[PDB]
Design a binder for this molecule. Structure first.
Ligand SMILES: CC[C@@H]1C(=O)N(C)c2cnc(Nc3ccc(C(=O)N[C@H]4CC[C@H](N5CCN(CC6CC6)CC5)CC4)cc3OC)nc2N1C(C)C
Ligand SMILES: CC[C@@H]1C(=O)N(C)c2cnc(Nc3ccc(C(=O)N[C@H]4CC[C@H](N5CCN(CC6CC6)CC5)CC4)cc3OC)nc2N1C(C)C
Ligand SMILES: [Zn+2]
Ligand SMILES: [Zn+2]
Lengths: 293, 293
């Protein structure tokens, strides 16, 4: 094997990070809490060994992820605080999100209450508005990529499938990777762009409100077939205003969906209660939003 | 971890296999030479731990592979000699192919001579004729799945993506897995059948004669795009009769390709030299097929 160092030094910034506890691993990366030995402030470190970056294509994907993410700064995007490397590893320094992601929330709570769905969906949309106006398509928005800080604020992360739109009307023809909430224009390989992320948000909203994803089966290719056929249903207990907005977003024709900028003007948002914040108990117990002191 | 036993007992057949040397691993399986303690004859054992078969879908794929393969017996198909299980593992007993596969040959020889290509391609086609007349589509014919015994005879193996055609004109809509030489009707998800294997044979013939696969790029999705666009070329040094047959097989429209039964009647075969066998040196040195004693 090749061992990961206990202290990480960036020679340009002159900065040292002590490697703390293990956060998880996925794709090519192992992740740890890392504290700046000097400033003592804590980060999420993503460490990827160069032994798995032997092919130029895999290196280029890494370089792109970093290039896209380093140029982003927004309240609902994961803060990018630096990156550096030695002969064995690439280290990326990211904003630590102490409440993990909406994945862990969903596992614990299943369907959320409408106001909670509204609260998270608004921050997800705001994050994505920022992306899209800077010509970035995320292309893998999912529960696992929507991180939550201490105050239950959403931070969009994992730009491993993101791409920049370089000219007006550019249709991306290729997507290297397998998103979760994957849009029909991708699956048929007919060309794709910004609308891909609105599709994913539609899936996310369905999941948050219903407690299961709209095209789930026990087989991935069977699911892609459902998505091709637009074969989902919205349970009757879902409110019509929410159901309508889901249906607008989850449409086969990309050009028929709303754009990211329209969404917060939908009646789902403008005529429903949007809490200003959620108490920490919302990780565990459904909130009833009492008017009581 | 969970340790694999040194001796494998099948309680129905009453048979014991001593576990010999490690052959390799891929997907979910570790593979070893295994000798029948009684008869002393040697097999290839594919051992897959049940800890990776926790989902019904993954178990069903295994059951299907076995069901398809156990019902097959042909000179150019890998012999199926049994299967059994304990609480921790499934064990499959297969014909040992001491010369590994055409993958290892290709790595060592690159482009083969025309007569060699003819020799292997004929056995590949014969194996596939057998499959197709028993309504089996292999769906992942590639160099790595075309094993060679001591006498350099081809044995088609890995039925992990195979499917049975249950009625006339059935179009398979789904393929769980990622073939190497993947046909355009699969990639676009428009429905597919027997023609898928002829496409793969076209790719195999290209590879055997040219020394590289027809749609290779440094990115898998980029390759799928080439295949969508039928974007390959045949080098000028390839003989026109071979080039013509490749082009007939490597066509976007499935219904425009030859069927497996037509192939051996192609001029590529009927008007070229087909050696009756190849000497062992053909693993390493190009043969010149001298008429000299
Ligand atoms: C860095 C990349 C990405 C990203 O881009 N950003 C921006 C990001 C930001 N912030 C975080 N935070 C946390 C992530 C995770 C945790 C955790 O508790 N992890 C635990 C998960 C279960 C593990 N257990 C399972 C049961 N095992 C026992 C066996 C019997 C069952 C023993 C081992 C132990 C570790 C805490 C966090 O915060 C304190 N993660 C991020 N990630 C990734 C980690 C997905
Ligand atoms: C069973 C499933 C499938 C199947 O369905 N059928 C029907 C089948 C039939 N027959 C075989 N035969 C053989 C397969 C393989 C070998 C070999 O030499 N393997 C070696 C490969 C390199 C490994 N090395 C690499 C360098 N490492 C050192 C480091 C520094 C580089 C050390 C470890 C050591 C083992 C020999 C065979 O025959 C004697 N395999 C089959 N397979 C699979 C194995 C693909
Ligand atoms: Zn599947
Ligand atoms: Zn790629």
């Amino acid at each position: 094997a090749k061992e990961i160092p206990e202290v990480l030094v960036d020679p340009r910034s002159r900065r040292r990070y002590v490697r703390g506890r293990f956060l998880g691993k996925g794709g090519f990366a192992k992740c740890f809490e890392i504290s700046d030995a000097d400033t003592k402030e804590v980060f999420a470190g993503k460490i990827v060994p160069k032994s798995l970056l032997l092919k130029p294509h895999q290196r280029e994907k890494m370089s792109m992820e970093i290039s896209i993410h380093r140029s982003l700064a927004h309240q609902h995007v994961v803060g990018f605080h630096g990156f550096f490397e030695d002969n064995d590893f690439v280290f990326v320094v990211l904003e630590l999100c102490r409440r993990r992601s909406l994945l862990e929330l969903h596992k614990r709570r299943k369907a959320l209450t409408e106001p909670e769905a509204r609260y998270y969906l608004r921050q997800i949309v705001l994050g994505c508005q920022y992306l899209h106006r800077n010509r970035v398509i995320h292309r893998d928005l999912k529960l696992g990529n929507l991180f939550l800080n201490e105050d239950l604020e959403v931070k969009i992360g994992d730009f491993g499938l993101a791409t920049k739109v370089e000219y007006d009307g550019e249709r991306k023809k290729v997507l290297c990777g397998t998103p979760n909430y994957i849009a029909p224009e991708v699956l048929s390989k007919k060309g794709h762009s910004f609308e891909v992320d609105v599709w994913s948000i539609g899936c996310i909203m369905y999941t948050l409100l219903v407690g299961k994803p709209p095209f789930e089966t026990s087989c991935l290719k069977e699911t892609y077939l459902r998505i091709k056929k637009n074969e989902y249903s919205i349970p009757k207990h879902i409110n019509p205003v929410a159901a309508s907005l889901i249906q607008k977003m989850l449409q086969t024709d990309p050009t028929a969906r709303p754009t990211i900028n329209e969404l917060l003007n939908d009646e789902f948002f403008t005529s429903g209660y949007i809490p200003a914040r959620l108490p920490i108990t919302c990780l565990t117990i459904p909130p009833r939003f009492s008017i009581a002191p």
